[PDB]
Design a binder for these strands. Structure first.
Ligand code: K
Ligand code: K
Ligand code: K
Ligand code: K
Ligand code: K
Ligand code: MG
Ligand code: MG
Ligand code: MG
Ligand code: MG
Ligand code: MG
Ligand code: MG
Ligand code: MG
Ligand code: MG
Ligand code: MG
Ligand code: MG
Ligand code: MG
Ligand code: MG
Ligand code: MG
Ligand code: MG
Ligand code: MG
Ligand code: MG
Ligand code: MG
Ligand code: MG
Ligand code: MG
Ligand code: MG
Ligand code: MG
Ligand code: MG
Ligand code: MG
Lengths: 50, 114, 142
RNA sequence: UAAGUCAGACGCAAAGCUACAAGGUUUCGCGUCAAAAGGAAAAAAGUCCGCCAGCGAGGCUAAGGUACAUAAA
RNA sequence: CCAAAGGCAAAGCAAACGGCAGCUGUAACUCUAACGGCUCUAAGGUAGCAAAAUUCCAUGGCAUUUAAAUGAUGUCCCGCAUGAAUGGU
RNA sequence: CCUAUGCAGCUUUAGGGCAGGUUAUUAUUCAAUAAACUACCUUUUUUCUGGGACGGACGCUCUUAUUAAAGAAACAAGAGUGAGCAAUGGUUUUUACUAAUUAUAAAAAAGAAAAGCUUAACUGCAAUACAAACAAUUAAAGCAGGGGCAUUGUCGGCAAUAAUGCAUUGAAGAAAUA
RNA sequence: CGUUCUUCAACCAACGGAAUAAAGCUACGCUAGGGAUAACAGGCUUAUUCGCUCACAGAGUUUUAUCGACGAGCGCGGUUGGCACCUCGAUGUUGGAUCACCGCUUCCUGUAGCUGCAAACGGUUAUAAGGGUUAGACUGUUCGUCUGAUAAUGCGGUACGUGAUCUGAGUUCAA
RNA sequence: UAAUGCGAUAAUACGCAUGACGGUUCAUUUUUGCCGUGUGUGGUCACGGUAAAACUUAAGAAUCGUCCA
């Protein structure tokens, strides 16, 4: 298990923090979630939390 | 995960036996007092009606299930009842009961489970 | 060598005929020994709370499979189950706050009074600060 | 009272630990001592009766007593 | 015996500071093991001495000494934990 | 002998420093810097405990005795845990099913499995209560926005009871000033 | 350069975590305190130890002469323990020398029964505390082993009696 | 609750069919014991509880068996 950053693809800078298991799902996770900057659901992509 | 009980003034009840299906509509004022039945229709009444005009096989048949739904619709319409809540129990999953419920919804009566 | 876990107070909080107001906890339990009845709710940890103004009731039911079920009910003030009782409950809630403030006294303050105003977000009051503090309405356009 | 206190003790009644021991130890219910003079049991912190503002050569009682020591059959 | 961890030095130094093993089979009856097999380490304590100013079992076994010996002397000995310039006899 | 806001001397491969000598590098015709060796200076080396040392222990859950409200201690007793899951989350349909967990008489309009679509494991707030020295910790009706499955119900993660860490300091994304 | 919002990380597991980090010796020791807390003695307790009664199984083999058990109860305060009640502005340690008072659970000197008691020498039970209870080798010893005699060489309490009467061999300061 | 219940094609149009005997499963608080609290020289005391545990005789209901005395 690891902590990852889900970053908006709208380039607004908004992000979410979630937990993922890299071995069970060895691919970039993507989800639809609300973006307060824009005001609607958009597509988010996994990124390194650092 | 049982849900909390919700009080409703009008409820629909079904009693499925070996031989017939009974439907009742009862009005309540409070959970602590008895209700008043406003509609009482069973497949026994439908069988006596249809058999005279159109031969049917037995009371527990598709023809009688639709007939019971039609008779229930007329009584509720006459008394100005358009929305009812269904009481869910073991008998509610009977095939005969489910056919009656489907017919009622198509006729125009709004039946709600929750 | 020793040690003990922090105690959890399982058990009922009210008996038959006791008056409750919305949001009050009636039962704390680890498992669903008691089920929610009328005018009540249940939390994700089986905590039962009241949702209207009324009195607590207890009842037992025998199920189809021979098991025993126990319910918790809240009964309206005058056995009024009509849909108009909701507005009466809303007024009673406002009144109850006024009674408490009168009994407590003026020196038990119930609202803050700072030398500054709290920011507004999405039409409500927010406890989070803005990057810069400014006086309201002391600036003109351009 | 933004004060003092955070060393407690035993009796009757229960449970854990000890050996259904300790005037042992750890919790718990009531009482007394601590901070409580006076009376009864020999002396008597914790048992029984009972709570001292002062004086008096008046009277009735409690626990306990009523052939001598020692007040009363 | 200079391996490891340090110090010093000309990449070497122990009379510098320090270290110096274990299991198992075997000779007529028996016993013992001269003699074999295996593991590991930088090296595996050699001579000498030894119930000691060093010995837990302990007042060890034997001899001398006394009428009587937890004493003294001699002697047997892998010695819990002796030992060669912190020197051995 | 034990207990201190304890003191002192001594030792070292306990922490930090360079301020004499040696050594290394560099520069001017007795100098400057130092993770080295010697000398010197300064600082640290818990508590609980049937006395102290030795041993053991320190967070958070379940269960046993002190009966059938709650609460309740001992270096009393019997067991767990410092996670896992991209579905094992959310929501609809079907039925020859009603289990399992560290432990446990949870649960039938409920669950498990099978089939389909999904990301509410959200943004901004919140009446009223449980508990509680305080800090924090626990449950939650309801309002606005954008969504999922249904077609007017539910979703603010997981049957429930453990899977944790204040402030400070540091770092990243965005925005407002200067 | 500074502020707010969305977030995360390290040592805090002695887990309310901070003086950034960080081990020992003292018998050469020193000061401030406690019988709130140990070592010797007293006290409480009696598991253990010791004694008696019931039990009469089993050995002896007619005898409960004598020996003796499973198990249970009661008593003693002398053995090994438990507790921490008195004393830390101080209750001098072990053994012996010298001089003692008391108990009886009797080693000798007494009295009365039984006996697997012919006599002698014994065994065992009840009762009895006036007198007596040895000189030496080894060992700091208590104890223990041994030697020559003796009617016999008993046990225990008394701050495990006794240092303002003596001793200092052991233990327990500085080499 | 005969518009019941059960069934071996189990579906319900067809089969068994509501009585009678037998065996199983579920009132003077039945009245004694026992337990809890208060008081107590350790019981010649008081009240309550047992729908927590032992303990009586019925009557009824739910299946089941049955050519029926
Ligand atoms: K030397
Ligand atoms: K002790
Ligand atoms: K700490
Ligand atoms: K003292
Ligand atoms: K004698
Ligand atoms: Mg967020
Ligand atoms: Mg633990
Ligand atoms: Mg304190
Ligand atoms: Mg205290
Ligand atoms: Mg005590
Ligand atoms: Mg005092
Ligand atoms: Mg009188
Ligand atoms: Mg007189
Ligand atoms: Mg030597
Ligand atoms: Mg020499
Ligand atoms: Mg300590
Ligand atoms: Mg608080
Ligand atoms: Mg919706
Ligand atoms: Mg949920
Ligand atoms: Mg701290
Ligand atoms: Mg001193
Ligand atoms: Mg004391
Ligand atoms: Mg004490
Ligand atoms: Mg005698
Ligand atoms: Mg003596
Ligand atoms: Mg003495
Ligand atoms: Mg003297
Ligand atoms: Mg010395």
């Amino acid at each position: 298990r690891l902590l990852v950053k889900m970053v908006s693809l709208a380039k607004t800078g908004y992000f979410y923090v979630t937990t993922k298991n890299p071995r069970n799902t060895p691919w970039k996770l993507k989800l639809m979630k609300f973006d307060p900057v824009v005001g609607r659901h958009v597509l988010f992509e996994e990124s390194k939390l650092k | 995960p049982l849900k909390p009980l919700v009080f409703r003034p009008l409820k629909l009840f079904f009693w499925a036996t070996n031989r017939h299906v009974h439907a009742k509509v009862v009005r309540f004022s409070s959970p602590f007092n008895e209700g008043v039945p406003v509609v009482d229709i069973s497949t026994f009444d439908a069988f006596n009606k249809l058999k005279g005009s159109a031969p049917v096989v037995a009371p527990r048949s598709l023809e009688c299930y639709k007939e019971v739904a039609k008779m229930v619709k007329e009584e509720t319409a006459r008394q100005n009842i358009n929305e009812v809540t269904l009481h869910l129990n073991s008998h509610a999953s009977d095939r005969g009961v489910r056919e009656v419920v489907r017919e009622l919804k198509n006729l125009g009566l709004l039946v709600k489970k929750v | 060598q020793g040690g003990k876990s922090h105690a959890k107070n399982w058990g009922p909080k009210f008996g038959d005929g006791e008056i409750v107001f919305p949001g009050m906890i009636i039962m704390r339990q680890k498992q669903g020994i008691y089920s929610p009845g009328y005018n009540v709710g249940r939390g994700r940890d089986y905590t039962i709370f009241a949702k209207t103004v009324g009195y607590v009731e207890y009842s037992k039911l025998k199920t189809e499979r021979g098991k025993t079920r126990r319910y918790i009910h809240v009964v309206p003030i005058n056995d009024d189950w009509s849909p108009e009782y909701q507005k009466l409950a809303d007024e009673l809630v406002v009144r109850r706050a006024e009674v408490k403030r009168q009994i407590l006294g003026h020196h038990v303050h119930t609202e803050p009074a700072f030398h500054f105003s709290l920011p507004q977000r999405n039409g409500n009051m927010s406890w989070l600060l803005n990057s810069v503090h400014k006086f309201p309405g002391t600036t003109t356009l351009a």
